[PDB]
């Protein structure tokens, strides 16, 4: 059976599409306002050098901070999000923030050269730029693998925004008070996505896609954990906090 999207489901999708268009600039016209990217000579990928300089940390910290502000705006527009207590809202935003950033970044990721291209050469981020920000291959390599796998699913924008919404409203986040409400909200998003795929998504791969999408959410949890480990070590570097921003410090600190 392939039931049609209900009126409510169509409206949910329309709201999510609109929320993403208001919170995701595909021209990347605000990036010049961030602290400029600085790329030093580190051909050897020296952990010591990278840690002593962190030349890309200020720029990427601003990009991530800017993105967190956009994700918050996006979340507030998710049907049902505002019915939760602010306490539960904060908990969900903090624990999913980096996952949504990795998800939403897929839009700027290109398989031409395995990089995130955001306009001109100055705003093209490769593996080497991330190591210059203080992170190691243990997080970077799986991150790239994740980006390629997500790209290959060739998701419609409707499925892309539904996945980010589902990612944010997870009942199994450490610290949630009303897990039942959150689960109710997530199920409504999940059924919408499942219905949309069977309904609007053409073959090959008509089915299976949902499972593949749910699996990516699991993958994210792992990246979340690894990023968290590396951020901690990174905060051990003296004078590091000044290279970040208050928002990043509170969300990952």
Which positions make up the binding site for calcitriol? Answer: 24, 67, 104, 108, 135, 227
CA-to-CA dists, residue 21 to 27, 148, 161, angstroms: 12, 23, 10
Sole window of 135-143, 148-156, 158-166, 177-185 interacting with ligand EB1 (rule: CB under 6 A): 135-143
Q: In what order do the strands lie in the sheet with 115-117?
A: 109-110, 115-117, 124-125
SS3 call for 22: helix
Q: How far apart are CA 160 and CA 189, in angstroms?
A: 12
Q: Which of 130, 150, 168, 220 binds ligand EB1 (CB under 6 A)?
A: 130
Sole window of 32-40, 96-104, 167-175, 184-192 interacting with ligand EB1 (rule: CB under 6 A): 96-104
Q: Is the dihedral of CA 241, 246, 249, 252 positive or negative?
A: negative
> Would you count residue 102 as binding ligand EB1 (CB under 6 A)?
yes
Q: How far apart are CA 182 and CA 166, in angstroms?
A: 10
How far from each other are the two terminal CA atoms of the chain, in whole angstroms?
48
Q: Which of 101, 127, 153, 184 binds ligand EB1 (CB under 6 A)?
A: 101
What's 20's DSSP letter?
A: H
**Do 153 and 77 form a contact (C-beta atoms < 8 A)?**
no
Q: Which of 105, 170, 186, 192 binds ligand EB1 (CB under 6 A)?
A: 105
The three-point CA angle 19-25-29 to 5° equals 155
> Would you count residue 231 as binding ligand EB1 (CB under 6 A)?
yes
What residues contact 89, with CB distance under 8 A and at least 6 apart?
Answer: 75, 81, 82
Sole window of 2-10, 40-48, 133-141, 166-174 interacting with ligand EB1 (rule: CB under 6 A): 133-141
Q: Which of 12, 16, 93, 139 binds ligand EB1 (CB under 6 A)?
A: 139
> Would you count residue 57 as binding ligand EB1 (CB under 6 A)?
yes
Shortest Cβ 12–ligand EB1 spacing (Å): 23
Binding mask 106-125 for ligand EB1 (x = CB under 6 A): -xx-------x-x------x
Q: Kindly report the backbone phi and psi dihedral angles of residue 40, in degrees, each rounded to the nearest multiple of 5, phi listed first.
A: -85, 170
Shortest Cβ 104–ligand EB1 spacing (Å): 5
Shortest Cβ 76–ligand EB1 spacing (Å): 17
Shortest Cβ 249–ligand EB1 spacing (Å): 9
Q: Kindly report the backbone phi and psi dihedral angles of residue 49, in degrees, each rounded to the nearest multiple of 5, phi listed first.
A: -60, -50
Residues that bind ligand EB1 (CB under 6 A): 57, 60-61, 63-64, 67, 101-102, 104-105, 107-108, 116, 118, 125, 130, 133, 135, 139, 143, 231, 244, 248, 252
């Amino acid at each position: 059976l392939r039931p049609k999207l209900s009126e409510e489901q169509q409206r949910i999708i329309a709201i999510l599409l609109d929320a993403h268009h208001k919170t995701y600039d595909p021209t990347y016209s605000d990036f010049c306002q961030f602290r400029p990217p600085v790329r030093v000579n580190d051909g050897g990928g020296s952990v010591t050098l990278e840690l002593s300089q962190l030349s890309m940390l200020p720029h990427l910290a601003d990009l991530v901070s800017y993105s967190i502000q956009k994700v918050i705006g996006f979340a507030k527009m998710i049907p049902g999000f505002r019915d939760l207590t602010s306490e539960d809202q904060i908990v969900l935003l903090k624990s999913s923030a980096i996952e949504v950033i990795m998800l939403r970044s897929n839009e700027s990721f290109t398989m031409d050269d395995m990089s995130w291209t955001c306009g001109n050469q100055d705003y093209k981020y490769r593996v080497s730029d991330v190591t210059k920000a203080g992170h190691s291959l243990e997080l970077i390599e799986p991150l790239i693998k994740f980006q390629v796998g997500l790209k290959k699913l060739n998701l419609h924008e409707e499925e892309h925004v539904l996945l980010m919404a589902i990612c944010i409203v997870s009942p199994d986040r450490p610290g949630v008070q009303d897990a039942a409400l959150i689960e109710a909200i997530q199920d409504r998003l999940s059924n919408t996505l499942q219905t949309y795929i069977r309904c609007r998504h053409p073959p090959p791969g008509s089915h299976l896609l949902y499972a593949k999408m749910i699996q990516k959410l699991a993958d994210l949890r792992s990246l979340n954990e690894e990023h968290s480990k590396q951020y901690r070590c990174l905060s051990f570097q003296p004078e590091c906090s000044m290279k970040l921003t208050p928002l990043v410090l509170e969300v990952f600190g």
